[PDB]
Design a protein around this motif. Structure first.
Motif, mmCIF file in Angstrom:
data_model
loop_
_atom_site.group_PDB
_atom_site.id
_atom_site.type_symbol
_atom_site.label_atom_id
_atom_site.label_comp_id
_atom_site.label_asym_id
_atom_site.label_seq_id
_atom_site.Cartn_x
_atom_site.Cartn_y
_atom_site.Cartn_z
ATOM 1 N N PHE A 1 0.847 -1.184 0.000
ATOM 2 C CA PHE A 1 0.000 0.000 0.000
ATOM 3 C C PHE A 1 0.885 1.236 0.000
ATOM 4 O O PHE A 1 2.041 1.195 0.425
ATOM 5 C CB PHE A 1 -0.947 0.018 1.208
ATOM 6 C CG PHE A 1 -0.257 0.286 2.519
ATOM 7 C CD1 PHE A 1 0.461 -0.712 3.157
ATOM 8 C CD2 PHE A 1 -0.327 1.535 3.113
ATOM 9 C CE1 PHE A 1 1.097 -0.469 4.362
ATOM 10 C CE2 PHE A 1 0.305 1.785 4.316
ATOM 11 C CZ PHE A 1 1.019 0.782 4.942
ATOM 12 N N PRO B 1 -7.581 -0.072 5.109
ATOM 13 C CA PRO B 1 -7.696 -0.674 6.447
ATOM 14 C C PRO B 1 -8.988 -1.445 6.636
ATOM 15 O O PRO B 1 -9.005 -2.423 7.392
ATOM 16 C CB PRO B 1 -7.610 0.532 7.392
ATOM 17 C CG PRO B 1 -8.104 1.663 6.596
ATOM 18 C CD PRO B 1 -7.695 1.397 5.176
ATOM 19 N N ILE C 1 -8.236 -4.981 4.930
ATOM 20 C CA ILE C 1 -7.322 -5.762 5.759
ATOM 21 C C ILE C 1 -8.024 -6.223 7.029
ATOM 22 O O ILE C 1 -7.909 -7.387 7.434
ATOM 23 C CB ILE C 1 -6.053 -4.947 6.076
ATOM 24 C CG1 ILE C 1 -5.119 -4.896 4.863
ATOM 25 C CG2 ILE C 1 -5.324 -5.530 7.274
ATOM 26 C CD1 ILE C 1 -4.504 -3.532 4.620
ATOM 27 N N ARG C 2 -8.778 -5.322 7.666
ATOM 28 C CA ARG C 2 -9.525 -5.685 8.866
ATOM 29 C C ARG C 2 -10.564 -6.758 8.568
ATOM 30 O O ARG C 2 -10.719 -7.713 9.338
ATOM 31 C CB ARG C 2 -10.184 -4.437 9.456
ATOM 32 C CG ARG C 2 -11.129 -4.689 10.614
ATOM 33 C CD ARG C 2 -11.630 -3.369 11.184
ATOM 34 N NE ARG C 2 -12.522 -2.675 10.262
ATOM 35 C CZ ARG C 2 -12.244 -1.518 9.677
ATOM 36 N NH1 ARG C 2 -11.097 -0.893 9.888
ATOM 37 N NH2 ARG C 2 -13.140 -0.973 8.858
ATOM 38 N N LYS D 1 -8.624 -10.222 7.862
ATOM 39 C CA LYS D 1 -8.070 -10.850 9.058
ATOM 40 C C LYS D 1 -9.165 -11.326 10.005
ATOM 41 O O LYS D 1 -8.955 -12.279 10.764
ATOM 42 C CB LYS D 1 -7.126 -9.885 9.775
ATOM 43 C CG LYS D 1 -7.810 -8.672 10.382
ATOM 44 C CD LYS D 1 -6.797 -7.629 10.809
ATOM 45 C CE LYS D 1 -5.850 -8.185 11.859
ATOM 46 N NZ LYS D 1 -6.575 -8.893 12.949
ATOM 47 N N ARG D 2 -10.336 -10.682 9.981
ATOM 48 C CA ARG D 2 -11.450 -11.159 10.794
ATOM 49 C C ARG D 2 -11.973 -12.493 10.277
ATOM 50 O O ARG D 2 -12.333 -13.374 11.065
ATOM 51 C CB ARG D 2 -12.571 -10.120 10.819
ATOM 52 C CG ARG D 2 -12.316 -8.928 11.726
ATOM 53 C CD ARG D 2 -13.263 -7.790 11.383
ATOM 54 N NE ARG D 2 -13.241 -6.729 12.382
ATOM 55 C CZ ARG D 2 -14.051 -5.680 12.373
ATOM 56 N NH1 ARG D 2 -14.969 -5.524 11.433
ATOM 57 N NH2 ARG D 2 -13.935 -4.762 13.330
ATOM 58 N N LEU E 1 -0.468 -11.746 7.511
ATOM 59 C CA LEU E 1 -0.264 -10.692 6.540
ATOM 60 C C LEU E 1 1.107 -10.063 6.726
ATOM 61 O O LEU E 1 1.592 -9.912 7.851
ATOM 62 C CB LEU E 1 -1.360 -9.641 6.700
ATOM 63 C CG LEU E 1 -2.770 -10.229 6.587
ATOM 64 C CD1 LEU E 1 -3.680 -9.610 7.631
ATOM 65 C CD2 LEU E 1 -3.341 -10.025 5.192
ATOM 66 N N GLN E 2 1.737 -9.706 5.612
ATOM 67 C CA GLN E 2 2.996 -8.968 5.622
ATOM 68 C C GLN E 2 2.741 -7.639 4.921
ATOM 69 O O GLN E 2 2.805 -7.554 3.690
ATOM 70 C CB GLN E 2 4.109 -9.763 4.949
ATOM 71 C CG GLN E 2 4.488 -11.036 5.693
ATOM 72 C CD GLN E 2 5.987 -11.195 5.875
ATOM 73 O OE1 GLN E 2 6.509 -11.048 6.981
ATOM 74 N NE2 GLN E 2 6.686 -11.500 4.788
ATOM 75 N N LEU E 3 2.450 -6.608 5.706
ATOM 76 C CA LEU E 3 2.104 -5.303 5.167
ATOM 77 C C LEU E 3 3.367 -4.517 4.840
ATOM 78 O O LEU E 3 4.359 -4.575 5.572
ATOM 79 C CB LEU E 3 1.233 -4.532 6.159
ATOM 80 C CG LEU E 3 -0.018 -5.303 6.585
ATOM 81 C CD1 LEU E 3 -0.728 -4.609 7.733
ATOM 82 C CD2 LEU E 3 -0.958 -5.492 5.403
#
Lengths: 207, 205
Positions: free
Chosen positions: A12, A23, A26-27, A30-31, A38-40
């Motif tokens: 990003f 966000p 991603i949120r 992951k939920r 994750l590798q941000l």
């Protein structure tokens, strides 16, 4: 095989992170897939596109219009209005909407287009409709940092609407009148990549 | 020093500290004819530019290598706060005892960018009795707060970073200790530039 186990490298830009989709996606992912890890990674558009090509990334939130984008799968995400960044002490801050022709004599605090692309072009086109080209004073490497320079009365700027969350005092945000300048974002990944984790992340982004 | 050029450096987080926009603002009013060149970058970049001559003064974080042949002036020691997502369980706390985040993932910047700020975080957690579990490593604190909104973890940022007001994020002061973010003014000792001399006066008073 199901994308509930494994690893995903998401990229990003620092400017895109303010857009609620990055966000929020991603949120949401992951939920739904808490065991995927994750590798941000932050970077400008050209750098992340080079990482996707080299295999160092799996998916990237980037600005459309970068060179070589015809190789990847691009996926336009929702647009964002472009607003004006100006000081509360500026007389135009008294206007609800600001016609850019009013600010044709102000130093514009912009960013290198290689970073901005769509964001930068929206400013030039926005001023072009007002009958002028922007007078550039300084070019900042991080687009969000124009707000702090507007606080130092270094000039004005145009940022995506999401950057209104940056509440520095002495700076206000105003929409553009008689015009709809807009900022664009894109989801990018490798063509032919059948990774289940990548597939799950795209579907949580898309829809 | 009404004529000449001045090159001022600063980091992304330091730009949110009132000392930096206030000094640039006051200098611009006092010396309009002086060409001001603003440069952004982390501390090590600014310090290397001061040493080579590409910059005249910088607002950076202490803990960089050297500080030799440079004059350093500490300017602000500011308190650090916790960044939490609204959905995070600790968000309900008005103030946070640091020990409750021992098992939480932390979002942080690499020590190279951070220096003393990063060390302050490690030190603060160590006093709370734990080593932090750095969830991700991102270069900008503005990106830290954005990833906190993604529920990727928690973080500890300078008090000036509350101005980021990212939706889905709350800020909370540390209850049982005082972690500190430091800011400093670095310039070449012996530099007789009147513009530099005048700008420092607007910083110190």
């Amino acid at each position: 095989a199901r994308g509930e186990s494994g690893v995903l490298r998401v990229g990003f830009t620092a400017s895109a992170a303010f857009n609620s989709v990055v966000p929020g996606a991603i949120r949401t992912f992951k939920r739904a897939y808490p065991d995927v890890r994750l590798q941000l990674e932050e970077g400008n558009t050209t750098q992340l596109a080079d990482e996707l090509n080299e295999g160092s990334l799996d998916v990237a939130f980037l600005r459309p219009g970068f060179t070589g984008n015809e190789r990847f799968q691009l996926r336009l995400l929702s647009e964002e209005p472009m607003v004006i960044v100006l000081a509360e002490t500026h007389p135009a801050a008294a206007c609800k909407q600001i016609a850019l022709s009013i600010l044709k004599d102000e130093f514009f605090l912009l960013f290198p287009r290689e970073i901005g692309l769509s964001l930068y072009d929206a400013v030039i086109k926005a001023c072009g409709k007002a009958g002028f080209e922007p007078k550039i004073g300084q070019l900042v490497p991080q687009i969000s940092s124009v707000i702090n320079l507007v606080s130092a009365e270094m000039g004005v700027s145009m940022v995506p609407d999401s950057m209104r969350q940056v509440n520095v005092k002495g700076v206000v945000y105003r929409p553009v009148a008689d015009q709809m300048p807009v900022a664009k974002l894109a989801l990018a990944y490798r063509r032919g990549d059948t990774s289940p984790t990548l597939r799950n992340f795209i579907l949580k982004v898309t829809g």
